[PDB]
Design a protein around this ligand. Structure first.
Ligand code: NAG
Ligand code: NAG
Ligand code: NAG
Lengths: 49, 105, 52, 53, 49, 265, 53
């Protein structure tokens, strides 16, 4: 005459706060670059988009 | 892998390990893993328990030093170096007796 | 206690302890009143990523 | 009686592994492994001495 | 089979070593700078780099 | 945010490689994590009564140990509780005190990870019998007139969490380097650099500004996190904040450099 | 598999086991089984001895 009831669910893990995989929908981009120029007998560094 | 371990008079276990792939070479065609009661006999290199070698020398040299600062201690801006009966070279960027080898505190 | 004129195999009895709480596990049966009960403990040894 | 090690001493060197992932300094550092023997027995060189007081 | 002999490396502080050729088979040498080794009792020496 | 330990003000010209000397001798994070929870206590006595007796390092203890005796004559002569580290007892016991063991003792403790040390002085005069054996205070330490041929105890009652047995190397050093421009507030300075004792390095801001501002490869191994800024751009002038945190030792240092960058005229 | 065991004040050995396939993930291309004296350093998740969650 006895009976058993069981139930369960699923939740996020605290480990998610440290390890995980992230999906993005990146579409476009911007360009930045570094140049070295010989000016007046010396190498000079420049950075620009 | 290959590890070694031992127990100290400190009642402590000190262990070390190195990854060393140990693969006994299969001697003969029959790849056997434990030698039999009955079977053929073939030559094979091995070692021996003799304790008297013939011109296989390894050099031994005077240890350079062991720089440990436990001997030091700050006494109101006055460093105290304790020797407890050894030969200790102290050297400090501080002026005065910057450098010196002594055997006394 | 004593119950006279009855077989021992007639029935069963259980000691009802409710003094020191027991932390939930699937194996242990539930107390049969509801799902949760007061009393919570944190799990130690957290996670972090380091170089190896 | 094969007594040539009067002035020898043990090491206390950086062993690659003192256990549990981190590498520390132990007296049982090893740096040479010989396995040329066909039989399979191996010589193991070890930092510290043995068989003496 | 051959045995590789590598004697104790030469360490130095506030000064530099030098390679002197050895008439030995496949003998090789090298030098490095900025190394700050540590031993059991602490740093070997003070010269940081 | 971190308690101040040194305030610095500097000024230079644009196009110069400046260096800020944010260093801490306590930041010598050994390569070695394990066994750095270990601390070493010991007792060393100098028999100044003789005046020529080299200070006898009687015995010592590490985390999880016993009395280890430097001398066999001390073996069967000294005891230190195996739980000294756990309860901080760090107290010596000598079974067979005599005139030979009369002198000034010192109970010393060193912490490997924090590099911190403690010590307490004791005096042990020797009496032939208990007709005058008693405790008193000379003025700086405690002096015991030990009854010869009897067991005596020297206490070491330091009970600081620092020395209590523990796994303390779970903690590791952290370094924050930020710049507060002329108009930014402290703790609102842009997070220029984050460093962790495990070699993790994080940089922010524009991609380029990161390279000029750099830290030596192995600052943690030396405890010197001096920050080098190469060919100072005059826009970099401001208050540079260097926060060094490691909580077990209690280290929460702040260093500040007021760097004003000029230009040639 | 994975078993645990302990010795009682009853001077009895109580042991349990579960079949749990424990496979350390190969970090990096070089499938290494014991970390080296010399080599590169890469990030990796792990635990810590802190006792306050
Ligand atoms: C701690 C570390 O060195 N790197 C990252 C950290 O930047 C990040 O915040 C965390 C999860 O957010 O995962 C880890
Ligand atoms: C000194 C201290 O703080 N605690 C105890 C002390 O009460 C005890 O008498 C001694 C050995 O008997 O060991 C230590
Ligand atoms: C510029 O870079 C080259 C690249 O090797 C180098 O040889 C030279 O010394 C640098 N400086 C100059 C050209 O002024």
């Amino acid at each position: 005459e006895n009976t058993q009831l069981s139930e369960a669910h699923v939740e996020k893990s605290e480990s998610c706060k440290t390890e995980f995989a992230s999906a993005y929908r990146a579409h476009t981009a911007s360009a930045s670059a570094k140049l070295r120029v010989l000016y007046q007998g010396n190498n000079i560094t420049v950075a620009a988009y | 892998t290959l590890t070694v371990g031992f127990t100290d008079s400190r009642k402590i276990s000190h262990t070390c390990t190195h990854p060393f792939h140990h693969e006994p070479p299969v001697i003969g065609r029959e790849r056997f893993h434990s030698r039999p009661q009955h079977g053929k006999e073939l030559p094979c290199s091995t070692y021996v328990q003799s304790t008297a070698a013939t011109a296989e020398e390894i050099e031994v040299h005077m240890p350079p030093d062991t720089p440990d600062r436990t001997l030091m201690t700050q006494q109101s801006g006055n460093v105290k170096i304790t020797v407890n009966g050894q030969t200790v070279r102290y050297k400090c960027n501080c002026g005065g007796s910057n450098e010196g080898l002594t055997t006394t505190d | 206690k004593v119950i006279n004129n009855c077989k021992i195999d007639q029935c069963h009895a259980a000691v009802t302890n409710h003094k020191n709480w027991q932390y939930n596990s699937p194996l242990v049966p539930r107390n049969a009143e509801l799902g949760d009960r007061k009393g919570k403990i944190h799990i130690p040894f957290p996670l972090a990523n380091v170089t190896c | 009686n094969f007594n040539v090690y009067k002035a020898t001493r043990p090491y206390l060197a950086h062993c690659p592994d003192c256990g549990e992932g981190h590498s520390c300094h132990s007296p049982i550092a090893l740096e040479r492994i010989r396995n040329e023997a066909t039989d399979g027995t191996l010589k193991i060189q070890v930092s510290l001495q043995i068989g003496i007081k | 089979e051959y045995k590789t002999v590598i004697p104790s490396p030469y360490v130095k502080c506030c000064g530099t070593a030098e390679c002197k050729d050895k008439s030995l088979p496949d003998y090789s040498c090298k030098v490095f700078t900025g190394v700050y080794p540590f031993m059991w009792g602490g740093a070997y020496c003070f010269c940081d780099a | 945010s971190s308690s101040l330990v040194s305030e610095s003000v500097v000024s230079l010209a644009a196009g110069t490689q400046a260096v800020l000397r944010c260093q801490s001798p306590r930041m010598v994070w050994t390569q070695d994590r394990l066994n750095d929870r270990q601390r070493v206590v010991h007792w060393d006595v100098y028999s100044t009564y003789y005046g020529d007796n080299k200070m006898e390092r009687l015995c010592d203890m590490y985390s999880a140990g016993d009395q280890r005796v430097y001398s066999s004559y001390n073996q069967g002569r000294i005891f230190m509780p195996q739980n000294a580290f756990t309860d901080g007892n760090f107290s010596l016991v000598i079974k067979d005190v005599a005139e030979s063991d009369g002198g000034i003792y010192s109970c010393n403790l060193h912490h490997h990870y924090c590099h911190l040390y403690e010590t307490v002085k004791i005096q042990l005069d020797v009496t032939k019998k208990a007709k005058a054996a008693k405790e008193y205070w000379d003025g700086e330490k405690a002096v015991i007139v030990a009854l010869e041929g009897s067991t005596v105890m020297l206490p070491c009652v330091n009970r600081n969490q620092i020395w209590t047995e523990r796994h303390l190397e779970e903690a590791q050093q952290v370094v924050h380097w930020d710049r507060q421009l002329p108009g930014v507030s402290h703790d609102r300075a842009d997070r220029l650099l984050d460093l962790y004792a495990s070699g993790e390095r994080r940089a922010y801001g524009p991609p380029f500004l990161r390279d000029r501002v750099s830290v030596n490869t192995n600052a943690f191994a030396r405890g010197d996190f001096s920050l080098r800024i190469d060919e100072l751009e005059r826009a970099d002038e401001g208050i540079y904040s260097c926060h060094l945190h490691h909580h077990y030792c209690g280290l929460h240092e702040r260093r500040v450099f007021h760097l004003q960058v000029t230009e040639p005229a």
